[PDB]
Motif scaffolding. Structure first.
Motif, PDB file in Angstrom:
ATOM      1  N   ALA A   1       0.804  -1.225   0.000  1.00 30.16           N
ATOM      2  CA  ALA A   1       0.000   0.000   0.000  1.00 30.16           C
ATOM      3  C   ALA A   1       0.837   1.275   0.000  1.00 30.16           C
ATOM      4  O   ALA A   1       0.325   2.340  -0.360  1.00 30.16           O
ATOM      5  CB  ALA A   1      -0.940   0.006   1.202  1.00 30.16           C
ATOM      6  N   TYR A   2       2.111   1.179   0.380  1.00 28.07           N
ATOM      7  CA  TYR A   2       3.055   2.274   0.198  1.00 28.07           C
ATOM      8  C   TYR A   2       3.280   2.579  -1.278  1.00 28.07           C
ATOM      9  O   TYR A   2       3.407   3.745  -1.668  1.00 28.07           O
ATOM     10  CB  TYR A   2       4.373   1.893   0.873  1.00 28.07           C
ATOM     11  CG  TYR A   2       5.459   2.940   0.843  1.00 28.07           C
ATOM     12  CD1 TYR A   2       5.429   4.016   1.705  1.00 28.07           C
ATOM     13  CD2 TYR A   2       6.525   2.839  -0.034  1.00 28.07           C
ATOM     14  CE1 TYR A   2       6.416   4.966   1.695  1.00 28.07           C
ATOM     15  CE2 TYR A   2       7.521   3.773  -0.046  1.00 28.07           C
ATOM     16  CZ  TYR A   2       7.461   4.834   0.821  1.00 28.07           C
ATOM     17  OH  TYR A   2       8.445   5.788   0.803  1.00 28.07           O
TER      18      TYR A   2
ATOM     19  N   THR B   1      -9.542  -6.252  13.705  1.00 27.98           N
ATOM     20  CA  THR B   1      -9.170  -5.364  14.798  1.00 27.98           C
ATOM     21  C   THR B   1      -8.513  -4.100  14.280  1.00 27.98           C
ATOM     22  O   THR B   1      -7.578  -3.579  14.892  1.00 27.98           O
ATOM     23  CB  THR B   1      -8.226  -6.044  15.781  1.00 27.98           C
ATOM     24  OG1 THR B   1      -7.017  -6.391  15.103  1.00 27.98           O
ATOM     25  CG2 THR B   1      -8.842  -7.287  16.382  1.00 27.98           C
ATOM     26  N   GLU B   2      -8.980  -3.579  13.154  1.00 30.28           N
ATOM     27  CA  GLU B   2      -8.413  -2.356  12.606  1.00 30.28           C
ATOM     28  C   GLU B   2      -9.423  -1.731  11.666  1.00 30.28           C
ATOM     29  O   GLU B   2     -10.441  -2.334  11.333  1.00 30.28           O
ATOM     30  CB  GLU B   2      -7.111  -2.629  11.865  1.00 30.28           C
ATOM     31  CG  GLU B   2      -7.305  -3.505  10.659  1.00 30.28           C
ATOM     32  CD  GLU B   2      -6.004  -3.832   9.970  1.00 30.28           C
ATOM     33  OE1 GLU B   2      -4.939  -3.417  10.471  1.00 30.28           O
ATOM     34  OE2 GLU B   2      -6.047  -4.498   8.918  1.00 30.28           O
ATOM     35  N   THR B   3      -9.117  -0.513  11.237  1.00 29.49           N
ATOM     36  CA  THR B   3      -9.855   0.168  10.187  1.00 29.49           C
ATOM     37  C   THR B   3      -8.858   0.858   9.270  1.00 29.49           C
ATOM     38  O   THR B   3      -7.642   0.695   9.397  1.00 29.49           O
ATOM     39  CB  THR B   3     -10.865   1.161  10.762  1.00 29.49           C
ATOM     40  OG1 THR B   3     -10.241   1.952  11.781  1.00 29.49           O
ATOM     41  CG2 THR B   3     -12.099   0.456  11.264  1.00 29.49           C
ATOM     42  N   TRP B   4      -9.382   1.618   8.318  1.00 35.06           N
ATOM     43  CA  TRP B   4      -8.581   2.270   7.299  1.00 35.06           C
ATOM     44  C   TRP B   4      -9.302   3.549   6.926  1.00 35.06           C
ATOM     45  O   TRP B   4     -10.516   3.527   6.718  1.00 35.06           O
ATOM     46  CB  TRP B   4      -8.417   1.369   6.069  1.00 35.06           C
ATOM     47  CG  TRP B   4      -7.609   0.146   6.323  1.00 35.06           C
ATOM     48  CD1 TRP B   4      -8.078  -1.078   6.660  1.00 35.06           C
ATOM     49  CD2 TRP B   4      -6.188   0.028   6.256  1.00 35.06           C
ATOM     50  NE1 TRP B   4      -7.041  -1.958   6.823  1.00 35.06           N
ATOM     51  CE2 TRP B   4      -5.868  -1.301   6.577  1.00 35.06           C
ATOM     52  CE3 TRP B   4      -5.157   0.919   5.957  1.00 35.06           C
ATOM     53  CZ2 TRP B   4      -4.567  -1.763   6.607  1.00 35.06           C
ATOM     54  CZ3 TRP B   4      -3.867   0.462   5.989  1.00 35.06           C
ATOM     55  CH2 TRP B   4      -3.579  -0.870   6.311  1.00 35.06           C
ATOM     56  N   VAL B   5      -8.575   4.656   6.859  1.00 36.54           N
ATOM     57  CA  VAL B   5      -9.127   5.926   6.415  1.00 36.54           C
ATOM     58  C   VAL B   5      -8.289   6.420   5.255  1.00 36.54           C
ATOM     59  O   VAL B   5      -7.057   6.417   5.332  1.00 36.54           O
ATOM     60  CB  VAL B   5      -9.134   6.976   7.535  1.00 36.54           C
ATOM     61  CG1 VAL B   5      -9.724   8.281   7.032  1.00 36.54           C
ATOM     62  CG2 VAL B   5      -9.889   6.477   8.711  1.00 36.54           C
ATOM     63  N   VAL B   6      -8.946   6.844   4.183  1.00 37.95           N
ATOM     64  CA  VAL B   6      -8.233   7.550   3.138  1.00 37.95           C
ATOM     65  C   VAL B   6      -7.897   8.949   3.631  1.00 37.95           C
ATOM     66  O   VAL B   6      -8.762   9.679   4.129  1.00 37.95           O
ATOM     67  CB  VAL B   6      -9.059   7.576   1.848  1.00 37.95           C
ATOM     68  CG1 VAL B   6      -8.326   8.330   0.762  1.00 37.95           C
ATOM     69  CG2 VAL B   6      -9.353   6.159   1.408  1.00 37.95           C
TER      70      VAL B   6
ATOM     71  N   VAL C   1      -3.963   8.493   1.046  1.00 37.48           N
ATOM     72  CA  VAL C   1      -3.189   7.323   1.425  1.00 37.48           C
ATOM     73  C   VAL C   1      -3.911   6.598   2.553  1.00 37.48           C
ATOM     74  O   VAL C   1      -4.140   7.182   3.613  1.00 37.48           O
ATOM     75  CB  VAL C   1      -1.754   7.659   1.860  1.00 37.48           C
ATOM     76  CG1 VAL C   1      -1.065   6.378   2.226  1.00 37.48           C
ATOM     77  CG2 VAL C   1      -0.990   8.363   0.760  1.00 37.48           C
ATOM     78  N   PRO C   2      -4.274   5.330   2.381  1.00 34.47           N
ATOM     79  CA  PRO C   2      -4.989   4.599   3.435  1.00 34.47           C
ATOM     80  C   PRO C   2      -4.084   4.243   4.602  1.00 34.47           C
ATOM     81  O   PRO C   2      -3.052   3.594   4.432  1.00 34.47           O
ATOM     82  CB  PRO C   2      -5.482   3.347   2.713  1.00 34.47           C
ATOM     83  CG  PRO C   2      -4.541   3.196   1.574  1.00 34.47           C
ATOM     84  CD  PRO C   2      -4.159   4.553   1.143  1.00 34.47           C
TER      85      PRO C   2
END
Lengths: 49, 36, 49, 300, 49, 49, 50, 49, 49
Positions: free
Chosen positions: A9-10, H36-41, H46-47
């Motif tokens: 993802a980098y 046990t995680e999330t992701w934000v743009v 960049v996520p």
């Protein structure tokens, strides 16, 4: 030579072959000891990430 | 024990606040995130 | 004239909970294969290993 | 509609090296034993009191400080200076050039002190006339009473080492004495490994007090015993040491305690006269990056 | 970064459909190029601008 | 081998831990967290220790 | 996973550019006359006040 | 300069009759997993975990 | 609220097809952002308004 689990993802994003980002315009004027702190520290997570 | 946790987890300048532990950002003003 | 620098990985590994998004591929998906190459498309629109 | 301008003419022109050292400041403080408008160079320094041939002292400056008239530089032409007189409750602009560099603060209080520091840091030696000009030491009052404080401690324990050096450890001395902790700030002075001797006469005084002074209170306690004798002073048996109350006035004869109790109070005034301050100026507003201040004089 | 795929598959899935593209498979991956220049990719005669 | 053994294990203090033991338990991402310098200064290139 | 899920809040800034409309003649203006005060007279500088 | 707030969860769970409205994902299917995680743009896309 | 995805997958299914979006899986989910400002998400070059 890159670790095996550096996540992909980098790589889609404009970034650096370094493990850190390296923009120096972020820092102040003429602060050499402060501008080295961006490049080489390991307590400070990146201006990238 | 308090000398253990802070290790495992983690002023002014010219009238403008300025943290010592960041000599630069790239992604704008670094926001905060909270816990409930 | 203008130069650039391009950025490029090869030969990585992704973590354990693997996933798919593709509707149509039936090849790779067995998790014992390990890729050791990439493919780049040129000025002449020609793939290169 | 009053006027004030103190021009100091000279005999010899200044060298090209000296004038740049006198353009290093353009506004400072000079004691100046005058009220005229034309004046010779033998008064604008402190070499009238503190010079090379005689040994320097610290009363005779502080006597001369409150006695004298302060003045502010305005200009250094090659022929002549141009000082400005300081009226009582005046208002003007002041920069600093002082060694070492004690950073100011606005809305503070200033005393005028002599240079007891390094001679290269203190003065500007003229070779055009062979005559020194010496600047006074402009320090805020809390720092000025603290920079004197531990140096006066520092000079007393030096003389113990020359008599018997097995009593004071210099690491214990060079840690608690040459450090100034005020405004949350640290400073470090000159240890002076050349040999000091400015503050010796206080150490000549204050140690000769310390046998006279606690001998002195026992006679005063048995002096005026009445039922008019003031009720607060019953309390101060609890403060006087246990050893002090075991002294007779027998051995020191009555014609000698006259010569004590005049000389007792004589040092206790002249030491008050210098610890109570000198001529002063309060500074109300200030900026750090210019070093320019805004003053109003307060005489004494 | 430029085009890359750790198998010949995902290059073909890249030029197949740009919209319903899949960037990550269980084994391999892809990087869409992000550059101040584009081109005309020309495998066969399918054109992905 | 008795006297190689008793004289090491007799009255022992807190048992020390080397670097290599300290790296070889910590998980894949936990190293890359800024809580730690003293496992990242000694990671220079993966051929040498 | 520890014993709980958790919710997060943030903020943001947007340097917007705004449009202000005002109708005609909804404010009356009373405008006095300017006066002079002086303050902080040194021997090297004199400051005024308007 | 308008500010806002942004409400945001992480680390949740769903009840017993789980399902999958899905075009296509071959990957995470089992009930043994627990995310046990999330992701934000990012602002700069960049996520971040 | 803004974007979240308890696995990496559903960001890709968010940006691949928005109309036939998959909002909920057995263990994973998504929140579409609802805000008075609307950006252009730019993973790769696929663009979601």
């Amino acid at each position: 030579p890159t670790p095996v689990t550096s996540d992909v993802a980098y790589f889609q994003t404009p970034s650096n072959p370094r493990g850190r980002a390296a923009c120096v315009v972020s820092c102040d004027a003429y602060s050499n000891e402060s501008a080295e702190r961006l490049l080489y520290d390991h307590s400070i997570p990146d201006p990238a990430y | 024990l308090h000398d253990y946790i802070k290790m495992k987890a983690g002023g002014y300048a010219a009238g403008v606040p300025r943290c010592e532990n960041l000599p630069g950002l790239s992604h704008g003003q670094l926001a905060t995130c909270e816990i409930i | 004239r203008i130069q650039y620098t391009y950025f490029f990985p090869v030969g990585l590994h992704l973590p354990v909970p693997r996933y798919s998004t593709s509707v149509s591929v039936r090849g790779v998906e067995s998790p014992a294969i390990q890729s050791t190459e990439t493919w780049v498309v040129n000025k002449n629109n020609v793939p290169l290993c | 509609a009053l006027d004030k301008s103190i021009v100091v003419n000279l005999t010899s022109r200044l060298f090209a090296d000296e004038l740049a050292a006198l353009q290093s400041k353009i506004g400072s403080v000079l004691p100046l034993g005058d009220c005229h408008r034309l004046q010779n160079i033998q008064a604008l320094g402190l070499g009238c009191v503190c010079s090379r041939e005689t040994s320097p002292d610290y009363i005779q400056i502080m006597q001369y400080l409150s006695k004298c008239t302060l003045a502010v530089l305005e200009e250094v032409r090659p022929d002549s200076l141009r000082l400005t007189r300081m009226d009582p409750s005046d208002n003007l602009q002041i920069k600093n050039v002082y060694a070492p560099f004690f950073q100011w603060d606005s809305n503070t209080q200033l005393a005028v002190l002599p240079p007891l520091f390094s001679r290269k840091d203190s003065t500007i030696v003229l070779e055009s006339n062979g005559f020194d000009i010496v600047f006074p030491m402009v320090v805020p009052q809390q720092l000025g009473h603290a920079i004197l404080q531990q140096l006066l401690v520092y000079h007393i324990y030096s003389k113990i080492s020359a008599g018997a050096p097995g009593d004071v450890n210099m690491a214990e001395l060079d840690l608690y004495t040459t450090n100034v902790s005020f405004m949350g700030r640290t400073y470090r002075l000159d240890v002076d490994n050349t040999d000091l001797r400015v503050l010796d006469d206080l150490s000549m005084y204050l140690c000769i007090l310390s046998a006279l002074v606690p001998r002195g209170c026992l006679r005063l306690l048995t002096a005026l015993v009445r039922h008019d004798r003031h009720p607060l002073t019953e309390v101060f048996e609890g403060v006087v040491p246990d050893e002090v109350t075991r002294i007779d006035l027998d051995q020191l004869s009555v014609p000698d305690d006259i010569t004590r109790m005049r000389v007792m109070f004589s040092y206790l005034q002249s030491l008050s006269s210098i610890f109570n301050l000198g001529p002063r100026l309060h500074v109300y507003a200030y900026s750090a990056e210019t070093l320019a201040a805004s003053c109003w004089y307060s005489p004494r | 970064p430029t085009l890359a795929a750790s198998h010949r598959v995902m290059l073909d899935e890249y030029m197949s459909n740009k919209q319903t593209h899949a960037p990550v498979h269980m084994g391999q991956y892809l990087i869409e190029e992000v550059a101040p220049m584009k081109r005309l990719l020309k495998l066969g005669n399918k054109v992905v601008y | 081998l008795f006297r190689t053994f008793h004289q090491y294990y007799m009255g022992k203090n807190v048992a020390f831990v080397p670097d290599v033991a300290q790296k070889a338990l910590v998980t894949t991402e936990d190293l890359l967290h800024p809580t730690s310098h003293r496992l990242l200064r000694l990671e220079v290139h993966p051929f040498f220790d | 996973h520890p014993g709980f899920a958790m919710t997060v809040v943030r903020t943001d800034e947007v340097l917007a550019e705004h449009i202000l409309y005002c109708s005609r003649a909804s404010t009356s203006m009373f405008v006095g006359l300017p006066s002079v005060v002086r303050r902080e007279v040194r021997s090297d500088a004199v400051t005024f006040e308007i």
